[PDB]
């Protein structure tokens, strides 16, 4: 058969990933421009939301060295690839869990609906890639919203998860943090309540 050049194989990001990819989180000096966890400036259109979460291993213990990358549509359901710190909104961001701060946070807007390749609407979601010591190739997941139950029930991606119980692992829980709308999205890498991870 036709065999292309093989892709470069993945390796773990390791425990010191934050020195390369999360300088402030590493408590190291930052450069003038960093890619970080504020996707939306106050004047971005849409519903401003705080996202937060903790990451657990197979023994139920906190993962305090995780590095997360996120990719989401703007409130209008459009992906904005022109990354610029001057933008009111960027579709891409980074966050981390650390020894000092075991709970990651993101400051964003709720994403609008995006159609799949067949034209079928997907429920509002944030794409997440999870990296850490012990993780040899990053884990892909999606964060959906518990106040989008009708859309979630019809999402062609959620519906590829055979068991309804596992779909529940991708639904972030609405709350309030200091008076502002927030969602908690915890990830369980292994075992009871294991978060669904995707291949694509």
């Amino acid at each position: 058969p036709i065999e292309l050049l093989p892709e470069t194989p993945s390796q773990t990001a390791g425990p010191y990933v934050h020195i390369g990819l999360a300088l402030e989180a590493a408590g190291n000096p930052t450069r003038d421009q960093e890619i970080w966890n504020r996707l939306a400036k106050p004047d971005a259109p849409g519903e401003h939301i705080l996202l937060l979460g903790q990451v657990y291993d197979g023994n139920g213990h906190l993962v305090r060295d995780s590095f997360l990358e996120v990719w989401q549509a703007d409130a209008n359901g459009e992906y904005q690839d022109a990354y610029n710190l001057e933008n009111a909104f960027n579709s891409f961001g980074r966050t981390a869990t650390t020894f000092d701060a075991g709970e990651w946070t993101l400051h964003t807007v709720k994403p609008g609906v995006v159609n799949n390749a067949a034209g079928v609407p997907m429920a509002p979601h944030i794409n997440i890639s999870l990296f850490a010591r012990g993780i040899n190739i990053h884990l892909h997941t999606r964060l959906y919203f518990d106040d989008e139950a009708q859309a979630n029930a019809k999402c062609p991606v959620l519906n590829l998860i055979e068991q309804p119980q596992r779909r529940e692992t991708l639904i972030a829980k609405r709350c309030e943090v200091d008076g502002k709308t927030a969602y908690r999205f915890d990830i369980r890498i292994q075992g009871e309540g294991e978060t669904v991870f995707f291949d694509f």
């Binding site: 197979g58 159609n115 596992r166």
Partner: protein, 238 residues
């Protein structure tokens, strides 16, 4: 805004390391036990950030100068350079390449690294750049020393540089590690050996590149990176 106009060759997850590779002890509790769920590519997966307008400082790619506290860092001066292409051999221009590493003695500038080998006051160990219009990147740095770590009772990372590459989409984004030609620690490392196929391990070994060296100044290594092949959509929804 970004558009869905391409598809990416599916990953070979027996070429990459598997999740559960128990000799790398931390993977035991940090590997999912359920199967990954395959999903079709949509605009969510086939797009990603373009960093053409990220503002880089003058020395962001030069670790000999980017942590200057009154002198040059100690250690083997090297250029690390290469090309990013996709599996079809197409260059990947204007893509973000980030790297981090220990100093010449195997010590990282992170609070959690308490290895007894000293920090170097003029070395920080972090770099970034964009590939140029032809897919080429280059850093200048110190060759890192092997790093002992609490896996088995006498385990040592080969000299290595961590790499992150964005590529055209979140589907191509990759984190990996570079190793150095001839290093006798490579065959012994349980993180290297998380990769089952010996031919895949070889793809991570940078080669000494005398052609790219500055005489009387610095040596050079070459490390090429291959991201998932990108193709146009065809015969979909019809």
């Amino acid at each position: 805004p970004a558009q869905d106009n391409s598809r990416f060759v599916i990953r070979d997850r027996n070429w990459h390391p598997k999740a559960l590779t128990p000799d790398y002890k931390t993977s035991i509790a940090r590997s999912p036990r359920q199967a990954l769920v395959s999903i079709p590519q949509s605009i969510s997966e086939t797009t990603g950030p373009n960093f053409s307008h990220l503002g880089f400082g003058a020395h962001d790619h030069d670790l000999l100068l980017n942590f200057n506290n009154g002198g040059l860092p100690i250690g083997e001066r090297i250029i690390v350079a290469g090309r990013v292409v996709d599996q079809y051999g197409k260059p990947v221009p204007n893509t973000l390449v980030e790297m981090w590493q220990a100093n010449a003695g195997g010590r990282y500038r992170h609070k959690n690294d308490r290895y007894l080998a000293p920090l170097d006051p003029n070395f920080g160990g972090v770099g970034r750049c964009l590939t140029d219009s032809d897919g080429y990147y280059s850093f200048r740095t110190i060759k890192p020393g092997p790093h002992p770590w609490r896996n088995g009772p006498n385990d040592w990372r080969p000299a290595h540089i961590h790499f992150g590459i964005s590529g055209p989409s979140i589907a191509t984004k990759l984190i990996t590690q570079l190793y150095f030609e001839g290093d006798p620690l490579i065959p012994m490392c349980p993180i290297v050996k998380s990769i089952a196929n010996p031919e895949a391990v070889q793809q991570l070994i940078a080669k000494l590149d005398m052609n790219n060296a500055n005489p009387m100044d610095c040596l050079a290594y070459r490390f090429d990176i291959v991201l998932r092949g990108q193709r146009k959509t065809h015969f979909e929804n019809c």
